[model samples]
Target: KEGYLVKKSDGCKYDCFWLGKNEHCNTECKAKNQGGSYGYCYAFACWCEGLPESTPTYPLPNKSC
Candidate 1:
């Protein structure tokens, strides 16, 4: 974790927990016509754990954000 860093955690939806990594996924409800969507909910990946704590390292390449 010292070298690896968290790139980004884009929100997930129906595909959030469909892969079975439920612990790393989060969901939220939405009102109708909020984003031209439905009266349902969506999900996204949250803060990752057991990782490094460094500067905003977002310029890394190769599978990076």
Candidate 2:
């Protein structure tokens, strides 16, 4: 991925390894309140078999707090 990038479905792109702004696409996809892919989660891409890291574990903060 040294010279590669992910072209987002919305005509945009970024270096996938950086977790760049494209990760927000699904959010934007939802705010617009469209169909299908709305509000979906996203992640990064890789080449080799990187050791699987544990998924983040946390409670959603209470907005009222």
Candidate 3:
């Protein structure tokens, strides 16, 4: 499965907050295709699985919190 990683800084724009952190990633990945299995946040990054490798990396914010 294709995978993508978004840093905490970038994650905020995607709504990777304390709750529902993975929701946006899941939505974006699914929008790209129907194969999206899951999206998750860990440490300083948010991750999405089953997305095309060509997907562009999201931009980062100055602050994550």
Candidate 4:
């Protein structure tokens, strides 16, 4: 995680997916990466710049971007 936790909100904090360092993907990209790792979730994924940076994991809009 090069950037700081710009906006860590409360929601479904669950194990999502993993991504290779030298690759790009389009899976459960809303999840947070494990310690020293990268993954996805249901609402948000900070690394993937192209994707919607922040998502509504709980109230469909409880948190906004």
- lDDT of model 4 at position 15: 29
Q: Write the per-residue lDDT of candidate 2 for residues 1-65, one digit (tens) a residue.
A: 02112333333233243443445543443333332232222355311111123311111122211
Best-to-worst lDDT order: 3, 4, 2, 1
Best by lDDT: 3
Models 1 onward score TM values of: 0.20, 0.19, 0.42, 0.19
Off by over 4 Å in 4: 1-11, 17-25, 28-46, 52-60, 63-65
Q: Residues 1-65, candidate 4, lDDT per residue (tens digit)?
A: 32222234454333224534322332334335422244323344334332233432322345443
Clashing residue pairs in candidate 2 are none
Q: Residues 1-65, candidate 1: write the lDDT tens digits.
A: 22122334632212333332343232221212111111211343222232335433233544434
Every model: Cα RMSD to truth = 13.2, 16.1, 5.9, 10.3
Q: Write the per-residue lDDT of candidate 3 for residues 1-65, one digit (tens) a residue.
A: 53445554443433355544556655666664546667776543556666555554444335433
How displaced is residue 4 in candidate 2, in Å? Answer: 15
| Off by more than 4 A, model 1 | 1-19, 22-42, 55-65
Clashing pairs in 3: none
Clashes of 3: 0
Instruction: Candidate 4: give the clashing pairs.
Output: 30-41, 30-44, 31-40, 31-41
- lDDT for 31 (candidate 3): 67
